[PDB]
Design a protein around this motif. Structure first.
Motif, PDB file in Angstrom:
ATOM      1  N   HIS A  55      11.100   1.694 -12.265  1.00 12.10           N
ATOM      2  CA  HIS A  55      10.073   0.651 -12.236  1.00 12.10           C
ATOM      3  C   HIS A  55       9.842   0.108 -10.830  1.00 12.10           C
ATOM      4  CE1 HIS A  55      11.185   0.563 -16.574  1.00 12.10           C
ATOM      5  NE2 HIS A  55      12.417   0.552 -16.098  1.00 12.10           N
ATOM      6  N   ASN A  56      10.841   0.204  -9.954  1.00 13.45           N
ATOM      7  CA  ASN A  56      10.748  -0.341  -8.606  1.00 13.45           C
ATOM      8  C   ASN A  56      10.448   0.724  -7.553  1.00 13.45           C
ATOM      9  OD1 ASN A  56      13.180   0.891  -9.027  1.00 13.45           O
ATOM     10  ND2 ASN A  56      14.390  -0.582  -7.821  1.00 13.45           N
ATOM     11  N   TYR A  57      10.174   1.965  -7.967  1.00 10.74           N
ATOM     12  CA  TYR A  57      10.098   3.054  -7.001  1.00 10.74           C
ATOM     13  C   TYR A  57       9.023   2.794  -5.957  1.00 10.74           C
ATOM     14  CZ  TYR A  57      10.282   7.655  -4.907  1.00 10.74           C
ATOM     15  OH  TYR A  57      10.409   8.701  -4.007  1.00 10.74           O
ATOM     16  N   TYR A  58       7.793   2.508  -6.403  1.00 10.84           N
ATOM     17  CA  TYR A  58       6.692   2.355  -5.454  1.00 10.84           C
ATOM     18  C   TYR A  58       6.816   1.092  -4.623  1.00 10.84           C
ATOM     19  CZ  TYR A  58       4.524   6.191  -7.917  1.00 10.84           C
ATOM     20  OH  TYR A  58       4.265   7.416  -8.473  1.00 10.84           O
ATOM     21  N   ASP A  59       7.590   0.102  -5.086  1.00  9.16           N
ATOM     22  CA  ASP A  59       7.906  -1.035  -4.226  1.00  9.16           C
ATOM     23  C   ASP A  59       8.810  -0.610  -3.077  1.00  9.16           C
ATOM     24  OD1 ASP A  59       8.076  -2.474  -7.340  1.00  9.16           O
ATOM     25  OD2 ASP A  59       6.666  -3.308  -5.876  1.00  9.16           O
ATOM     26  N   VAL A  60       9.797   0.238  -3.357  1.00 17.22           N
ATOM     27  CA  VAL A  60      10.721   0.661  -2.311  1.00 17.22           C
ATOM     28  C   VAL A  60      10.109   1.781  -1.464  1.00 17.22           C
ATOM     29  CG1 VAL A  60      12.990   1.655  -1.904  1.00 17.22           C
ATOM     30  CG2 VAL A  60      12.714  -0.120  -3.658  1.00 17.22           C
ATOM     31  N   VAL A  61       9.429   2.742  -2.096  1.00 15.63           N
ATOM     32  CA  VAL A  61       8.873   3.912  -1.413  1.00 15.63           C
ATOM     33  C   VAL A  61       7.368   3.703  -1.284  1.00 15.63           C
ATOM     34  CG1 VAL A  61       8.427   6.391  -1.510  1.00 15.63           C
ATOM     35  CG2 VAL A  61      10.703   5.476  -2.164  1.00 15.63           C
ATOM     36  N   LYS A  62       6.922   3.301  -0.095  1.00 19.78           N
ATOM     37  CA  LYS A  62       5.503   3.013   0.079  1.00 19.78           C
ATOM     38  C   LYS A  62       4.670   4.293   0.206  1.00 19.78           C
ATOM     39  CE  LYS A  62       3.071   1.747   4.378  1.00 19.78           C
ATOM     40  NZ  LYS A  62       3.362   1.096   5.685  1.00 19.78           N
ATOM     41  N   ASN A  63       5.273   5.406   0.632  1.00 16.53           N
ATOM     42  CA  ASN A  63       4.542   6.658   0.859  1.00 16.53           C
ATOM     43  C   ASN A  63       5.338   7.822   0.291  1.00 16.53           C
ATOM     44  OD1 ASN A  63       3.664   5.065   3.749  1.00 16.53           O
ATOM     45  ND2 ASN A  63       2.027   6.024   2.543  1.00 16.53           N
ATOM     46  N   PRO A  64       5.152   8.131  -0.988  1.00 15.64           N
ATOM     47  CA  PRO A  64       5.924   9.212  -1.598  1.00 15.64           C
ATOM     48  C   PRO A  64       5.580  10.547  -0.962  1.00 15.64           C
ATOM     49  CG  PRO A  64       4.798   7.827  -3.240  1.00 15.64           C
ATOM     50  CD  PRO A  64       4.162   7.574  -1.921  1.00 15.64           C
ATOM     51  N   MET A  65       6.568  11.432  -0.916  1.00 13.00           N
ATOM     52  CA  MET A  65       6.301  12.779  -0.445  1.00 13.00           C
ATOM     53  C   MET A  65       7.205  13.741  -1.201  1.00 13.00           C
ATOM     54  SD  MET A  65       4.296  14.685   1.281  1.00 13.00           S
ATOM     55  CE  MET A  65       3.351  13.280   1.895  1.00 13.00           C
ATOM     56  N   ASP A  66       6.772  15.006  -1.260  1.00 17.57           N
ATOM     57  CA  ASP A  66       7.466  16.048  -2.014  1.00 17.57           C
ATOM     58  C   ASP A  66       7.050  17.411  -1.470  1.00 17.57           C
ATOM     59  OD1 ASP A  66       4.851  15.450  -3.702  1.00 17.57           O
ATOM     60  OD2 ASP A  66       5.505  17.535  -3.990  1.00 17.57           O
ATOM     61  N   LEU A  67       7.873  18.427  -1.751  1.00 22.17           N
ATOM     62  CA  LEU A  67       7.616  19.766  -1.208  1.00 22.17           C
ATOM     63  C   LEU A  67       6.314  20.372  -1.725  1.00 22.17           C
ATOM     64  CD1 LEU A  67      11.032  21.681  -1.109  1.00 22.17           C
ATOM     65  CD2 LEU A  67       9.844  20.504   0.740  1.00 22.17           C
ATOM     66  N   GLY A  68       5.942  20.091  -2.972  1.00 24.83           N
ATOM     67  CA  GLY A  68       4.708  20.666  -3.479  1.00 24.83           C
ATOM     68  C   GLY A  68       3.498  20.078  -2.790  1.00 24.83           C
ATOM     69  N   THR A  69       3.545  18.787  -2.471  1.00 27.18           N
ATOM     70  CA  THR A  69       2.451  18.197  -1.714  1.00 27.18           C
ATOM     71  C   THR A  69       2.406  18.772  -0.307  1.00 27.18           C
ATOM     72  OG1 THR A  69       2.559  16.165  -2.993  1.00 27.18           O
ATOM     73  CG2 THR A  69       1.468  16.070  -0.827  1.00 27.18           C
ATOM     74  N   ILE A  70       3.572  18.976   0.300  1.00 29.37           N
ATOM     75  CA  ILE A  70       3.619  19.547   1.642  1.00 29.37           C
ATOM     76  C   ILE A  70       3.037  20.959   1.631  1.00 29.37           C
ATOM     77  CG2 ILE A  70       5.248  20.287   3.452  1.00 29.37           C
ATOM     78  CD1 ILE A  70       6.898  17.758   2.645  1.00 29.37           C
ATOM     79  N   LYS A  71       3.370  21.750   0.608  1.00 31.57           N
ATOM     80  CA  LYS A  71       2.780  23.083   0.519  1.00 31.57           C
ATOM     81  C   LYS A  71       1.262  23.001   0.423  1.00 31.57           C
ATOM     82  CE  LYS A  71       2.682  27.369  -2.160  1.00 31.57           C
ATOM     83  NZ  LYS A  71       3.257  28.459  -1.321  1.00 31.57           N
TER      84      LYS A  71
END
Ligand SMILES: CCOC(=O)Nc1cc(-c2ccc(C)c(NS(C)(=O)=O)c2)nn2c(C)nnc12
Length: 114
Positions: free
Chosen positions: A43-59
């Protein structure tokens, strides 16, 4: 567009392929896709992580040619690890997997031509 940059990005594409390789699956798999906040209950993820990133997005970003050079690419990779480090307690298994995968990445990224 420059050959220097064209070559930087080919090396990056090769590094991306390396960390997606079956070799590293057992510690790379949680980074294949965006963190599924809803399915997981974070529930708090987007509060702590303002800019999510992942390998599939990087690809996909690489595929769309969105990285101007190797360091723009490394920043997204390193953002992904930093997001894991910042959100999770240090002894959660996903942090061990992130450290392992980051050691793969930095080992190969440190060889990119200067
Ligand atoms: C205190 C508990 O906190 C956490 O559970 N942290 C994290 C959990 C998981 C995670 C778990 C299970 C699954 C099936 C998946 N796959 S998916 C579709 O979300 O990418 C991911 N990823 N993760 C990633 C990156 N970074 N942190 C975490």
């Amino acid at each position: 567009s420059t050959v220097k940059v064209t070559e930087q990005l080919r090396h990056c594409s090769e590094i991306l392929k390396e960390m997606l390789a079956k070799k590293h699956f057992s510690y790379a798999w949680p980074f294949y896709n965006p963190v599924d906040v809803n399915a997981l209950g974070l529930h708090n993820y987007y509060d702590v992580v303002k800019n999510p990133m992942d390998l599939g997005t990087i690809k996909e970003k690489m595929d769309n040619q969105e990285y101007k050079d190797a360091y723009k690419f490394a920043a997204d990779v390193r953002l992904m690890f930093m997001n894991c480090y910042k959100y999770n307690p240090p002894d959660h298994e996903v942090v061990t997997m992130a450290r392992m995968l980051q050691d793969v990445f930095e080992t190969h990224f440190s060889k990119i031509p200067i």
